[PDB]
Amino acid sequence: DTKEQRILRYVQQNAKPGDPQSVLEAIDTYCTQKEWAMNVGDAKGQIMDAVIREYSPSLVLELGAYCGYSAVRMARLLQPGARLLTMEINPDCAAITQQMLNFAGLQDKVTILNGASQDLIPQLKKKYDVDTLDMVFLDHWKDRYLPDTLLLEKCGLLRKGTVLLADNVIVPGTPDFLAYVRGSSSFECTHYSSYLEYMKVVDGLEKAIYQGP
Ligand SMILES: Nc1ncnc2c1ncn2[C@@H]1O[C@H](CSCC[C@H](N)C(=O)O)[C@@H](O)[C@H]1O
Ligand SMILES: O=c1[nH]cnc2c(O)c(F)c(-c3ccc(F)cc3)cc12
Ligand SMILES: [Cl-]
Ligand SMILES: [Mg+2]
């Protein structure tokens, strides 16, 4: 078995079905005590929670699902009828994520799409009936943050006030993306300093609010 299978089994055997908080706590326990994994984690997760509560987004797009930790984190704070779409290139992880969400009782709020972000983003309007996004969580791969931001804009998926929230802007780091959004009059940016999940290593999130062309 894989690390990701082991995380899912741990949740299944140490959390309560239908209880998102118990799922997050189980994942965080496993990943602190047993095996590190690239979940956004509790420290940065608390910042994400504060952002989600401030904006109450009706439609969120996540890039990079992994085991479903961040999807659970966000979806448990969505209002009735609000929705999360999450894109995941690795089919084994897409299946873990789906099972994680099912266990948490969040499956009605989330659509887990198996494919590359750069291939799926251009299909959101016609295939997935999206108009514009209220929030984007970028947490897939550092080198895709800038290209996928520019693709989102090309595809007409951003509106005035769309919130981009980017993980790992310090470690592994996303220098092109940061230089771009911080230098562009089309974004208003704020940095939230924190720590790499499960580690005493500095990391941070960037919030970049789209301001129109
Ligand atoms: N181009 C791409 N499109 C979609 N998924 C991608 C991708 N490149 C990498 N990924 C996926 O992005 C994930 C990064 S880890 C995601 C962690 C998750 N957001 C959490 O905090 O719980 C991996 O599962 C990886 O397979
Ligand atoms: O590739 C990633 N995608 C999404 N999130 C990540 C993450 O949160 C990480 F900490 C890391 C990471 C991996 C190894 C390290 F030594 C440090 C950070 C990687 C990713
Ligand atoms: Cl943490
Ligand atoms: Mg990350």
Swiss-Prot record:
Co-factor binding details: Binds 1 Mg(2+) ion per subunit.
PTM section of the record: The N-terminus is blocked.
One GO CC term on file: vesicle
Listed GO biological process terms: artery development; behavioral fear response; catecholamine catabolic process; catecholamine metabolic process; cellular response to cocaine; cellular response to phosphate starvation; cerebellar cortex morphogenesis; cholesterol efflux
Binding residues annotated for S-adenosyl-L-methionine, in chain numbering: V40, E62, S70, E88, I89, G115, A116, S117, Q118, D139
Keyword flag Metal-binding: yes
Superkingdom, natural source: Eukaryota
Catalytic activity: a catechol + S-adenosyl-L-methionine = a guaiacol + S-adenosyl-L-homocysteine + H(+); 2-hydroxyestrone + S-adenosyl-L-methionine = 2-hydroxy-3-methoxy-estrone + S-adenosyl-L-homocysteine + H(+); 4-hydroxyestrone + S-adenosyl-L-methionine = 4-methoxyestrone + S-adenosyl-L-homocysteine + H(+); 2-hydroxyestrone + S-adenosyl-L-methionine = 2-methoxyestrone + S-adenosyl-L-homocysteine + H(+)
Cofactor(s) annotated in UniProt: Mg(2+)
GO molecular function, one term: magnesium ion binding
Keyword terms of this UniProt record: Catecholamine metabolism, Cell membrane, Cytoplasm, Lipid metabolism, Magnesium, Membrane, Metal-binding, Methyltransferase, Neurotransmitter degradation, Phosphoprotein, S-adenosyl-L-methionine, Signal-anchor, Transferase, Transmembrane, Transmembrane helix
Enzyme Commission number(s): 2.1.1.6
Residues given in the record as Mg(2+) binding sites: D139, D167, N168
Chain ranges on the Extracellular side, renumbered to this chain: 1-213
Residues where substrate binds: K142, N168, E197
Family (UniProt): Belongs to the class I-like SAM-binding methyltransferase superfamily. Cation-dependent O-methyltransferase family.
Protein role: Catalyzes the O-methylation, and thereby the inactivation, of catecholamine neurotransmitters and catechol hormones. Also shortens the biological half-lives of certain neuroactive drugs, like L-DOPA, alpha-methyl DOPA and isoproterenol.
Name of the protein: Catechol O-methyltransferase
Origin species: Rattus norvegicus
Span within the parent record: 46 to 258 of 264
